[PDB]
Amino acid sequence: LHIPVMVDEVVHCLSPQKGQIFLDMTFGSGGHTKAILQKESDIVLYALDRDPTAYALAEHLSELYPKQIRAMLGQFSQAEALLMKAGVQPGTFDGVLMDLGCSSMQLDTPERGFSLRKDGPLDMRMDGGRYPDMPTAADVVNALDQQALASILRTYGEEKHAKKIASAIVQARSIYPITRTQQLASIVAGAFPPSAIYTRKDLLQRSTHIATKTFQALRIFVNNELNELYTGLKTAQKFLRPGGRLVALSFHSLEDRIVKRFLLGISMTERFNLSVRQQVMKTSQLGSRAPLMWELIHKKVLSPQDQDVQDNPRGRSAKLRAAIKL
Amino acid sequence: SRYSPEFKDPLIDKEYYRKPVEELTEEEKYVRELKKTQLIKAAPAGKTSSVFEDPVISKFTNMMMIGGNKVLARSLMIQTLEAVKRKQFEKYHAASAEEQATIERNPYTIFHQALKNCEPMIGLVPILKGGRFYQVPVPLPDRRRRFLAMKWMITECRDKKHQRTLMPEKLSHKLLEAFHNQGPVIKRKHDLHKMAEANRALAHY
Ligand SMILES: Nc1ncnc2c1ncn2[C@@H]1O[C@H](CSCC[C@H](N)C(=O)O)[C@@H](O)[C@H]1O
């Protein structure tokens, strides 16, 4: 079982109260959505997900609360149109809970293809066939050139060995099609000496497969999570009430940066991890930020309790960024 | 060029040659004795000594010329000058004796003043800074201001907004608008100036 990550913080943060309408742009399993419909019995809630399996869960769970929860299906970009059909263009949503990442059910079910450990079709697509033409991870690896595929790994996977892990994929695909998760994992391992398979470690300091950065990289290029995250936040702002509390959850750095640089106005094209020294050097050259539209409830990113991390290691990297619209 | 660097451009000016010798300075006397030893390029077909020669209108005609069709370009020019003159003779006969004094009927005076009202004093340059583009204001040389006035006027008349209107009617209408400090081309001048004022703090780049 997967407990909703930081459910206690997200509930306190949004303080759901009677007379307030809320949105959920990532229903998924619905653990967070259900934790929010428990504290306040008079709450109004809206749900959304990219997975039709997740949208069916919400529809089945809608029986528990007939109108307090309203289920919707679609991507972040398509969310505004879907909600615009309802007619809530101003929205006046008190809070938008934009949980991020892959659902526990999505990656616990081997058929969905998200787990390298198990053997499933190399789908790695949050979409559940709602768009049967949407390329899957298998398609991405078999088509793109080394330079193109290396960029996917480098930019989205934070993978130092992008050229080494991409060349192995290019050679492997020629010999046979890459259609299964384990088939890819073995190819990526084959780019390195056999001992490399578990040399790398996580921040938890527990050995991880040497292809855990290629499964994350493709997952984010197949589902365009990063570009869809920028529109998703923007749409929330337009549909978010003034004085309404937004709450995001970033499990990896790339998504965390966008949430940080969006709630603070920082340009998305600035250099990453800028030090104070570099900031001085940057502006010294020019010598020769706009008003913020948010009020961060908690100034610094929250993180899961160390005890809770061991119980749910999947959510160890959950960085909660809360803000109030201005 | 088929002219060697030794070839000098011809000076087509009747007055310059009839000027008496006594009025000449010792510097101007040297220039005249020097040119007698220099090679001179053949006069181009464009410019002559005619009293009706106008270098500004000849330049505007070339900026309107498409594919070397000078006959058509010049036809449009003279049709515009005739259309401007007829519009002013119509405004003149319909006016009172007092207003008639303020009505200009010379199309060359209107053409010149119409362009001078469109010349932008200051312009902007697209500059790159830190992977980001920001425009920078800069003074404009005299050549650039005159060229931009003629390019904005010709561009406006070629705009697709005008539906089935012939060029001599479009250009004549725009020239008379600019002659009165009104029109789209005058707005383009004002917008460029107003933008060059909002980027004054970027003048140090
Ligand atoms: N661009 C996008 N638009 C909509 N839903 C998206 C999305 N990217 C990811 N999702 C979905 O959002 C969820 C995030 S992970 C699951 C979190 C959810 N609160 C839970 O009950 O556990 C997944 O269901 C995922 O498929």
Residue A40, min C-alpha distance to chain B (Å): 48
CB proximity A269 to B under 8 Å: yes
CB A28 near ligand 1, within 6 Å: yes
Check: CB of residue B108 under 8 Å from CB of residue B57: yes
**Ligand 1 lined by A250 (C-beta under 6 Å):** no
The answer to whether A139 is a known ligand-binding residue is: no
- Only one residue has tokens 């119409």, namely B114
Q: Return d(Cα A31, Cα A315) in angstroms, integer.
A: 13
What separation in angstroms does the CA of A141 have from each of A50, A102, A119, A145, B42?
22, 20, 17, 8, 69
Tokens of B132: 């980001």
CB-count exposure of residue B146 (10 Å: 0-12, 13-18, 19+): middle
Residue with tokens 């616990």: A108
Min Cα distance B129 → chain A (Å) is: 9
Q: Ligand 1: which atom is nearest the Cα of residue A5?
A: 22
Are A288 and B131 within 8 A, CB to CB? no
> Residue with the nearest Cα to atom 8 of ligand 1?
A225
Q: Which helix (H) or strand (E) holds A282?
A: helix A276-287
Q: What is the resolution of this structure in A?
A: 3.3
A117 neighbors A215 (Cβ within 8 angstroms): no
Contact criterion met (CB < 8 Å) for A286 and B132: no
> Side-chain half-sphere of A183: how many Cα atoms within 13 Å?
19
Find out whether A209 is annotated in a ligand binding site.
no
Q: How far is CA A220 from the centre of its chain?
A: 8
> Is B131–A282 a contact, with Cβ atoms under 8 angstroms apart?
no
Which DSSP string do the residues of A166-232 spell out, in sequence order?
HHHHHHHHHHS---BHHHHHHHHHHTS-GGGGGT-B-TT--B--TTHHHHHHHHHHHTTHHHHHHHH
Interface probe, candidates A272, A286, A289, chain B, greatest B C-beta count within 10 A: A286
Q: Hey, CA dihedral for A116, A316, A52, A255, is it positive or negative?
A: negative
Ligand-binding site membership of A99 (annotated)? yes
Question: What's the gap in Å between A51 CA and the centre of ligand 1?
Answer: 8
Distance A311 CA to ligand 1 centre (A): 21
Name the residue of chain B whose CA is nearest to A286's CA. Answer: B205
Q: Whose CA is nearest to atom 15 of ligand 1?
A: A103
Residue A70 DSSP SS3: strand
What per-residue string of b and e applies to A195-221 under the rule 16 or more CB within 10 Å gives b?
A: eebeeeeeeeeeeebbbbbbbbbbbbb
Breaks (C–N over 2.5 Å) after residues, chain A: 288
Helix axes B184-198, B142-157, angle to 10 degrees: 130
Q: How many CB pairs under 8 A join A and B?
A: 8
Ligand 1 pocket member A228 (CB < 6 A): yes
Q: A269, B132: Cβ pair inside 8 Å?
A: yes
Q: Measured between alpha carbons, how far is A57 from B103 in angstroms, rounded to an integer?
A: 81
Both structure tokens of A82:
């879907």
Alpha-carbon span B157 to B193, nearest angstrom: 22
For helices A253-263 and A225-239, angle between their N-to-C axes, nearest 10 degrees: 30
Do the strands A21-24 and A95-99 form a parallel or antiparallel pair, or are they unpaired?
Answer: parallel
Contact (CB<8Å) B204/A282: no
What distance in Å separates residue B131's CA from the closest CA in chain A? 8
Return the closest-CA partner of residue A22 out of A42, A7, A49: A42
Six token digits for residue A134: 């949407």
Of the candidates A269, A282, A288, which has its C-beta nearest B205's C-beta?
A: A288
Are residues A288 and A137 in contact, defined by beta-carbon separation less than 8 angstroms?
no
CB contact under 8 A, A288 and B129: no
Q: Select the residue of A269, A282, A288 nearest B204 (Cβ to Cβ).
A: A288
Q: How far apart are CA A209 and CA A173, in angstroms?
A: 21
- Cα–Cα dist A180/A139, whole Å: 11
Residues from chain A that touch B133, judged by Cβ atoms under 8 A, are none
DSSP state of A273: T
CB of A99 within 6 A of ligand 1: the answer is: yes
H/E/C letters for each residue in chain B? CCCCCCEECCCCCHHHHHCCCCCCCHHHHHHHHHHCCCEECCCCCCCCCCCCCCHHHHHHHHHHCCCCCHHHHHHHHHHHHHHHHHHHHHHHHCCCHHHHCCCCCCHHHHHHHHHHCCCCCEEEEEEEECCEEEEEEEECCHHHHHHHHHHHHHHHHCCCCCCCCCHHHHHHHHHHHHHCCCCHHHHHHHHHHHHHHHCHHHCCC
Beta bridge partners of B136: B125
Residue A251 annotated as binding? no
**Residue at token pair 């029986």:** A63
Residue A200 — φ and ψ, nearest 5°?
Answer: -65, 155
Q: Find the helix or strand (DSSP H, E) in which A325 lies.
A: strand A319-325
Q: Which residues contact A311 (CB under 8 A, 6 or more apart)?
A: A3
- Region for A30 from its dihedrals, namely left if φ exceeds 0, alpha if ψ lies in -120 to 50, beta otherwise: left
Ligand 1 site, residue A128, Cβ cutoff 6 A: no
